[PDB]
């Protein structure tokens, strides 16, 4: 169980090589979380294990960049800059008629 206050994820542990290992993706919600194993079986020793894991949301160096859907905007600003430069070459050095 991958739990914050109530279980976000709950999966089975596939027996593989003497270890119970599961590979899964963390959910979208961030915060601190708890891996939890509970084995309550009739006539078996009740075992409980919880490990605490904090989940950082994102970093400003890891957002998606160079979106194709924003090729217009990415273009526009640059054109502006280019425009300015041409102006700064014609507005200064122009001979009146």
């Amino acid at each position: 169980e991958f739990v914050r206050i109530d279980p976000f994820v709950r999966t089975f542990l596939k027996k593989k090589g003497g270890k119970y290992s599961v590979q899964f993706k963390l959910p979208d919600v961030y915060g601190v979380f708890q891996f939890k194993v509970d084995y309550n079986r009739l006539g078996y020793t009740h075992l409980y294990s919880s490990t605490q894991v904090s989940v950082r949301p994102l970093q400003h160096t890891q957002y998606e960049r160079f979106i194709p859907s924003a090729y217009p905007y990415y273009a526009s600003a640059f054109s502006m800059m280019l425009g300015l430069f041409i102006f700064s070459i014609v507005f200064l050095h122009m001979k009146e008629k």
């Binding site: 859907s69 924003a70 217009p72 273009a75 054109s79 800059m81 050095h93």
Partner: protein
């Protein structure tokens, strides 16, 4: 949801078009660059200004903000010196 790439490319070409329109209008007026005379201060100013804008572009892809701000500090100081000299010369010639 995101639009298809064909539409974005069409709009990018359309955004390039106004620059061409501006150039056509400027050559209709008859604007010339005849007053430029290859004086060292003016050339240094234009070179520094172009380098500053190219640096502004480069910052967007690789450099972070501290490094870019440092580079801008240097290039802007140089462009400021060259521009002060050139603008003094221009004010003298104008009067």
């Amino acid at each position: 949801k995101r639009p298809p790439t064909v539409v974005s490319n069409t709009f990018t070409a359309l955004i390039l078009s106004p620059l061409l329109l501006l150039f056509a209008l400027w050559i209709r007026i008859g604007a010339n660059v005849s007053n430029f005379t290859f004086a060292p201060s003016t050339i240094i100013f234009h070179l520094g200004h172009a380098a500053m804008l190219g640096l502004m572009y480069v910052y967007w892809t690789q450099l972070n903000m501290f490094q870019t701000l440092k580079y801008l500090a240097i290039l802007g100081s140089v462009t400021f010196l060259a521009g002060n000299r050139m603008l003094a010369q221009q004010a003298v010639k104008r009067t």
